[PDB]
Every structure is written in C-alpha cells, then in structure tokens.
C-alpha cells in the first residue's frame, strides 16, 4: 500500500477549498483518511495543519481517529507514533484528542491487537473523562474483535454500567465487538437487559 500509494492530493485540495461547514470539514477529514488508508501518509494533514485545527469537539475526536485509519496495520510502532502525534498531557479540549488517539490506536490494530489490548485496557481503566472512555472503549473493542476475552468484557461492561450516554454508546458497541459471534448467553442477557433499563438513547 505504501509503495503503490498512487493517491491524488489534487482532489483533496480541490474539495478542501469548497469546505464552509464543520460537517464538510469532518467529511473531508474522513475522506482523506479513506484515500490514505493503510498508506501511513498524512501529507494532506501535514500541509493543512492550520485548517485541521478548525475541527472542534467531536470533530477533533474524528480527526485524531483518522490517523488510525491512515496508519492501519502499522504494527511496528504505534504507541510511540501516537505519542509523537499527541502530547502526554494537555488542558484545553484534550479529552477529544485523547479519545481519538485511543480510537485510532484501536483502528491501527483492528482485529490484531495482540499486545495492544493490555495498553488499551490499562488506559480505559485509568480514565476519568467520558470522551476518553468512549475513545478507549472503541479502541479496545476494535483491538479485541471476536477474542471474547473476559477481562476486556468485564471492563467494558463496567463502563457500560456507568450509565453515561457518550461512554455507554462506545461501551455497548465494543461489548458487541469483543464477543463477536460468541452468541454467549451472559453477553446477550447483560446487553439486552441493560438496553431494557437504560434511559440514554446513545447507549441503546
């Protein structure tokens, strides 16, 4: 993919000039991720950093997550790569970036989080902000697809039982992802019973 990365940046530049809304902004971010998926090439994000900074709130969560799509399969080093992209600690609006970083880490190791499941589990456990927990749940579920690991299931079920809409949506999606095709009675009972009890529609 990287050697044969015959991507056309002219189309991306042509449509970036037509962006006037945040919806189109995040659409262009996702499209740039798509045409550079698995190519580890963030050129469009590099030459448009000041335009990429226009993303705010969940758009940031998307933009950072776009990295994981671009660097999908870059298993050689990803924690160091994400730390290079993202500073360790930041006060202003960094919850979205941290959650997007965890989600992008899950995207990089989708279905193949052999050793990144431990890091994602530790990050999800040691998380306080709801956006960070949402991103970490998405990444952990993305990195444990079909593994049916009991520790991941328990942590994700605890996050779901925290009864936060933003956290609950990702917790339920990752609960389904981790037990993909397992048809386990316990998982079905827990998820359905919670869906018949929760009052937040995002969790549902």
């Amino acid at each position: 993919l990287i050697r044969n990365n015959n991507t056309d940046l002219m189309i991306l530049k042509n449509t970036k000039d037509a962006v006037r809304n945040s919806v189109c902004h995040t659409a262009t971010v996702i499209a740039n991720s798509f045409m550079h998926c698995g190519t580890t090439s963030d050129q469009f994000l590099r030459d448009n950093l000041e335009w990429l900074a226009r993303a705010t709130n969940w758009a940031k969560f998307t933009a950072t997550a776009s990295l994981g799509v671009i660097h999908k399969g870059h298993e050689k080093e990803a924690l160091q790569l994400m730390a290079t992209y993202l500073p360790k600690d930041t006060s202003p609006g960094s919850a979205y970036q941290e959650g997007g970083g965890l989600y992008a880490l899950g995207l990089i190791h989708a279905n193949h989080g052999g050793d990144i499941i431990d890091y994602l589990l530790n990050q999800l456990k040691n998380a306080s902000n709801d956006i960070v927990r949402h991103g970490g749940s998405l990444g952990l579920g993305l990195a444990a697809m079909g593994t049916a690991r009991q520790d991941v299931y328990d942590l994700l079920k605890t996050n779901l039982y925290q009864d936060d809409a933003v956290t609950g949506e990702a917790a339920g999606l990752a609960l389904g992802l981790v037990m993909l095709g397992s048809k386990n009675a316990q998982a079905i009972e827990d998820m359905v019973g919670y869906a018949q009890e929760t009052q937040h529609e995002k969790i549902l």
Binding site: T26, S33, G38, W58, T62, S66, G68, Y103
Partner: peptide
C-alpha cells in the same frame, strides 16, 4: 460520525 472510520476494516 466517528464510527465511519470502521469502514477501514
């Protein structure tokens, strides 16, 4: 919207 990234799978 962020769930669109799942298409990379």
């Amino acid at each position: 919207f962020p769930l669109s990234h799942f298409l990379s799978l």
